[PDB]
């Protein structure tokens, strides 16, 4: 006979979903500004339409996304192998190879073959092909069902070839599916360890050894992925809110008057711009107003130089004596003004140069000659009991705001600063006014030293541990607490600061007014420095490096306060115990989760329908009744549902039965399927308007065998509702096979196919003594036994033949002694072929690949390479018919036991 698939079909295998991921440069010389590049591509094996998308990028023209260009690829005859995405291991499924015939008026006769794969269990074995001949009408298709059972996990491959009779047209499709084990995906938490290197660990570092994945429900020989999640935990600290700029609108003052009155108007405008620049409240205040107040600050500095005396000092008039306070206060305002507007620096340093030559005794005392005509601007220094110490502190603070600007100009400035600091420490512990301890508490905390008792006296003079208060006008106490806030922000202490700022905000002092020069200037210089230097966070800076023995490198991540990599995941398919080294400041969380395949119940099949399929030979060659009963598993009746019926090979449904079924009230068989021919109709869909949840809805129709075949593949019935193909239920049917399943032998989720031959089919008369010795002395033949059949445990899945080992002719890899028992397994189709009788003796040999269980409970499989020969008894050899066999078997034993196998 002619096998038409002798066409040397190289099956189609390249079916990418996307390709042509290429980069081309249009270097060809342009014609009217358009370069044309010709590009030779090789189309893939898919029979579809490709959509090709180009995007160009040009230095002078930019980005351009082309319109999509389509390419349709087709043939007049081809296979479409409708493979699912995944199949569960050892679960029987029905795939569909759809064969298309787009000839106009030619009816094709095709020989189509499912190729054998050892990874699958089908009717195609190593010695038997699954070939069949089908008829395809023109401009039609035909679905060829194939029943397979995948036997090993991973990417496994299905190949179907076809070649047409009387035309030189052939095709083959070789696609692949994933074989997933019977379990369900599940995730478990391996470890949650909190990283804190300045609290855990030693010497600044924290090493955390992670155990590997502690799974005990895992399906054996399956992949697990461990996901390492390094994530920084941000922390925040409470900060007091800034003063609302709507309450500060009255501080924009046009400065006017003489040498003291000009500084009265200049003060609330310089300090408001300085506070609003630091808090950045100009958006909620008016951005246009910033430049107008900036010109008033320039107007203040311009008119103040008119009262700067030529001795680089400051007085109220040009004929007035100079002041120690007013010169120090112009130094205090002009130094804070440099950050926004500058003109001349020798005016600032010239006033500091006069402040030490004329008003610095070597005691370190600043003494006031008092030509300050306005006692309003003086603030708490007016009406002070220790007016000597409080003024030494005032001028010293003025020298430090101009120290960073006048370090090279006035080289004698650190001498007077040390002398002024020496006078403060001696009489610090003798003060009794809260204002003097506050202003000389900032004057000794600025770049200098306050002793342990001096810091203790500075903190214990705060009544209610939040405010500095003395008998007197409250603008002296608000000024004093503003000095004590700048002290606590100069010492970088922040445990005493929050009750101090809270009291300043609850005072609701917004500056401005009569006598408010010190109180407006200090309460917004101190609250600006609180917004300049503030703990918003706790400084997160973790350098966490992970040393994994799964690789040859250490992956690190600098988890700053920067929000670029707050969290970073590191996947590692290798399941090994690794080390997490974490050092630095701040806190962080580490999460390690491993996904895996958990062996649970394999009950995902038929979760929405019950389906019972029976095939009965009830009475043109063969005629059986196919009965399908189905029932929905819900609270209500299901909606429109689909019965995808597949015929067993060689069978076709009765056409008069389908026309009666289509006439039903809740059933629909389409006119397309009723008008089909009797042959080439191996699939059928009966549509159901409803299926009951209360009772089984049953239909039945006869099927006729129009073609006799040696091997009948089981048909299949599939039920699903229209809105969900995934919630389906498939039952197989086949006469002489249990529940329509192909013959397989399974143990602990490992099956092998049993569709092979029953045993070695060589006749007992065509075999000689030399033929028995040549076959049994092969190295593949592991065991050679003389057995005695004790019991035959009949079952529906497979027959078990318990053999007593009568003689160990050749001992294999199974240490079995004489008298012991081993079970020989064969499928139920071989029960009539083997013809094994109890208490009879047999010569048996086979391969070591036919072993089954573990070594304590080792079973043998009677496969295609297993020799089973009847051994007649000693009295039975007296017949002339058994003389040839008994002479061979007795010689076969003496040749193997006494002399063994050479080579």
């Amino acid at each position: 006979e002619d096998i038409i698939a002798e066409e040397n079909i190289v099956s189609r295998s390249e079916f990418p979903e996307s390709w042509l991921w290429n980069v081309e440069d249009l270097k060809e010389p342009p014609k009217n500004g358009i370069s044309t590049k010709l590009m030779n591509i090789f189309l893939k094996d898919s029979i579809t339409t490709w959509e090709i998308l180009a995007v160009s990028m040009s230095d002078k023209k930019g980005i351009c996304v082309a319109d999509p260009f389509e390419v349709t690829v087709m043939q007049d005859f081809f296979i479409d192998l409708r493979l699912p995405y995944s199949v569960v291991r050892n679960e029987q499924v029905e795939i569909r190879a759809v064969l298309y015939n787009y000839r106009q008026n030619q009816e094709l006769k095709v020989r189509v073959e499912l190729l054998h794969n050892p990874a699958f269990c089908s009717l195609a074995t190593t010695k038997r092909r699954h070939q069949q001949t089908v008829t395809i009408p023109p401009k039609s298709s035909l679905s060829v069902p194939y029943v397979i059972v995948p036997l090993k996990t991973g990417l496994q491959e299905v190949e179907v070839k076809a070649a047409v009779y009387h035309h030189f047209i052939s095709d083959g499709v070789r696609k692949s599916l994933k074989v997933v084990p019977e379990g369900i995906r599940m995730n478990k938490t391996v470890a949650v360890r909190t990283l804190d290197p300045e609290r855990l660990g030693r010497e600044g570092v924290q090493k955390e050894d992670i155990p590997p994945a502690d799974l005990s429900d895992q399906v054996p020989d399956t992949e697990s992925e461990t996901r390492i999640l390094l994530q920084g935990t941000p922390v925040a600290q409470m900060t007091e809110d800034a003063v609302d700029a709507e309450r500060l609108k009255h501080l924009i003052v046009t400065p006017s008057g003489c040498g003291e009155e000009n500084m009265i108007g200049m003060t609330p405008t310089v300090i408001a711009v300085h506070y609003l620049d630091e808090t950045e409240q100009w958006e909620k205040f008016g951005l246009e107003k910033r430049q107008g107040a900036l010109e008033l600050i320039k107007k203040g500095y311009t008119q103040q130089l008119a009262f700067r005396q030529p001795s680089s000092a400051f007085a109220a008039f040009v004929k007035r004596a100079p002041s120690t306070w007013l010169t120090a206060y112009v130094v205090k305002v002009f130094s804070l003004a440099v950050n926004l507007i500058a003109i001349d620096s020798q005016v600032l340093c010239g006033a500091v140069k006069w402040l030490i030559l004329e008003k610095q005794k070597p005691d370190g005392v600043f003494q006031e000659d008092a030509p300050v005509i306005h006692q309003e601007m003086i603030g708490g220094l007016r009406n002070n009991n220790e007016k000597d110490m409080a003024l030494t502190a005032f001028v010293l603070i003025s020298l430090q705001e101009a120290k960073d600007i006048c370090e090279e100009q006035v080289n004698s400035l650190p001498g007077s600063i040390t002398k002024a600091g020496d006078f403060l420490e001696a009489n610090y512990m003798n003060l009794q006014r809260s204002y003097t301890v506050a202003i000389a508490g900032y004057a000794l905390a600025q770049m200098g030293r306050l002793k342990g008792p001096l810091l203790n006296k500075f903190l214990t003079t705060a009544k209610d541990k939040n405010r500095w208060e003395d008998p007197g006008k409250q603008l002296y106490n608000v000024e004093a607490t503003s000095y004590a806030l700048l002290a606590l922000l100069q010492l970088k202490d922040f445990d005493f600061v929050p009750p101090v700022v809270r009291w300043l905000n609850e005072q609701r002092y917004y500056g401005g007014g009569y006598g408010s020069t010190q109180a407006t200037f200090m309460v917004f210089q101190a609250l600006a420095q609180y917004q300049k230097d503030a703990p918003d966070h706790q400084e997160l800076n973790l350098d966490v490096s992970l040393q994994l023995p799964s690789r040859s490198s250490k992956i690190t991540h600098r988890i700053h306060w920067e929000s670029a990599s707050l969290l970073r995941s590191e996947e590692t398919k290798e399941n090994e115990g690794f080390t997490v080294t974490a050092e630095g400041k701040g806190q962080g969380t580490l999460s390690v989760v491993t996904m895996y395949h958990a062996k649970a119940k394999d009950q995902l099949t038929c979760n929405k329908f019950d389906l019972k399929v029976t095939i009965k030979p009830a009475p043109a060659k063969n005629t059986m009744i196919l009965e399908i009963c189905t029932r929905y598993r819900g609270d209500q009746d299901a909606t429109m549902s689909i019965l995808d019926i597949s015929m067993m090979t060689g069978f076709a449904p009765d056409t008069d039965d389908l026309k009666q079924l289509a006439n039903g009230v809740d059933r629909y068989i389409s006119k397309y399927e009723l008008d089909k021919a009797f042959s080439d109709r191996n699939t059928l869909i009966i549509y159901l308007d409803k299926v009951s949840h209360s009772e089984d809805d049953c239909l039945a129709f006869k099927v006729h065998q129009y073609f006799n075949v040696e091997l009948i593949q089981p048909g299949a019935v599939k039920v699903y509702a229209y809105y969900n193909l995934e919630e389906s239920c498939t039952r197989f049917y086949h006469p002489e096979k249990e529940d329509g399943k192909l013959n397989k032998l399974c143990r602990d989720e490992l099956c092998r196919c049993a569709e092979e031959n029953c045993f070695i089919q060589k006749s007992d008369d065509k075999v000689t003594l030399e033929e028995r010795l040549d076959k049994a002395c092969e190295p593949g033949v592991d065991y050679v036994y003389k057995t005695r059949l004790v019991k035959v445990q009949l079952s529906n899945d497979f027959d078990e033949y318990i053999m007593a080992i009568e003689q160990t002719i050749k001992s294999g890899s199974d240490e079995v002694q004489v008298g012991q028992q081993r079970t020989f397994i064969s499928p139920i189709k071989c029960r009539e072929a083997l013809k094994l009788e109890e208490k009879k003796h047999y010569l048996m040999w086979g391969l070591s690949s036919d072993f089954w269980g573990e070594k304590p409970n080792l079973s043998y499989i009677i496969g295609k390479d297993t020799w089973v020969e009847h051994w007649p008894e000693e009295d039975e050899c007296q017949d002339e018919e058994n003389q040839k066999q008994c002479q061979d078997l007795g010689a076969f034993t003496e040749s193997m036991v006494v002399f063994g196998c050479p080579n």
Epitope: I4, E6, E7, N8, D76, R103, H166, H167, F168, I169
Partner: nanobody, 123 residues
Framework: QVQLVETGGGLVQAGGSLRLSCAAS????????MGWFRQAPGKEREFVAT????????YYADSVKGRFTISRDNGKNMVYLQMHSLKPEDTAIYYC????????????????WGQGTQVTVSS
């Protein structure tokens, strides 16, 4: 496209033999049908022999059924027609033709034909 050139023809005796070689322009691979056709003087163009794409399937006309043998070399882009046990009724112009594979025993599915060669078998 692709065109063909026929060689190997000439004058031969009645009982002798000769083989005709067909040269292809492009690569003859992936072309399913490769056929030989002949046209006797006074007669119509009739079918002689087709070969498979791989060479494993052939078809012959009943007049030349056990006498001719068609072969091809897909690596050399060549088709051959070995003509044995000649008859005087075989005198014809022999055409080599490229086909699609559909209905390979008829000329209706051959779109690329050759020049032809004269094979005279005198009595």
């Amino acid at each position: 496209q692709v065109q063909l050139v026929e060689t190997g023809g000439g004058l031969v005796q009645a009982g002798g033999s000769l083989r005709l070689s067909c040269a292809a322009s492009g690569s003859i691979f992936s072309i399913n049908a490769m056929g030989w056709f002949r046209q006797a003087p006074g007669k119509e163009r009739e079918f002689v022999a087709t070969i498979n794409r791989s060479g494993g399937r052939t078809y012959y006309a009943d007049s030349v059924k056990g006498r001719f043998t068609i072969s091809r070399d897909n690596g050399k882009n060549m088709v051959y027609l070995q003509m044995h046990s000649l008859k005087p009724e075989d005198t014809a112009i022999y055409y080599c033709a490229a086909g699609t594979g559909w209905s390979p025993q008829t000329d209706n599915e051959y779109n690329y034909w050759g020049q032809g060669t004269q094979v005279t078998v005198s009595s």
